[PDB]
Write a protein that binds this ligand. Structure first.
Ligand SMILES: [Zn+2]
Ligand SMILES: [Zn+2]
Length: 89
DNA sequence: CCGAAAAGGTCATGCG
DNA sequence: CGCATGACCTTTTCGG
């Protein structure tokens, strides 16, 4: 695979990291809802394409480990805003 | 021009 | 049934 989080297939960048649509949305919803997870085990559950949903905390933990930027998740004035932002005058 | 990039929108799906 | 997941879509811009 190519997803730096679960290992699934990935075609491009998401919140700074090569991720799959799965991890893509997970990171998003989490950051929007500001969800707070808790690990039942010992914060080191297996995060791969097959067991990525067994534990949330751990999946988000890795999302950050590989550097997904929480700041890139549009909010406020940018909430609901799609596509690429403008960079040129 | 045009399509690669990538952020949010959409439900069908399914397990709980 | 109720909510979470994720395959696929539409939206914006800009780089080749
Ligand atoms: Zn993944
Ligand atoms: Zn865990």
């Amino acid at each position: 695979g190519r997803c730096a989080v679960c290992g699934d297939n990935a075609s491009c960048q998401h919140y700074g990291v090569r991720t799959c649509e799965g991890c893509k949305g997970f990171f998003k919803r989490t950051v929007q809802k500001s969800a707070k997870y808790i690990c039942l085990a010992n914060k080191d559950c297996p995060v791969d394409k097959r067991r990525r949903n067994r534990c949330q905390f751990c999946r988000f933990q890795k999302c950050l480990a590989v550097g997904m930027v929480k700041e890139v998740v549009r909010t406020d004035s940018l909430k609901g805003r799609r596509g690429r932002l403008p960079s040129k005058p």
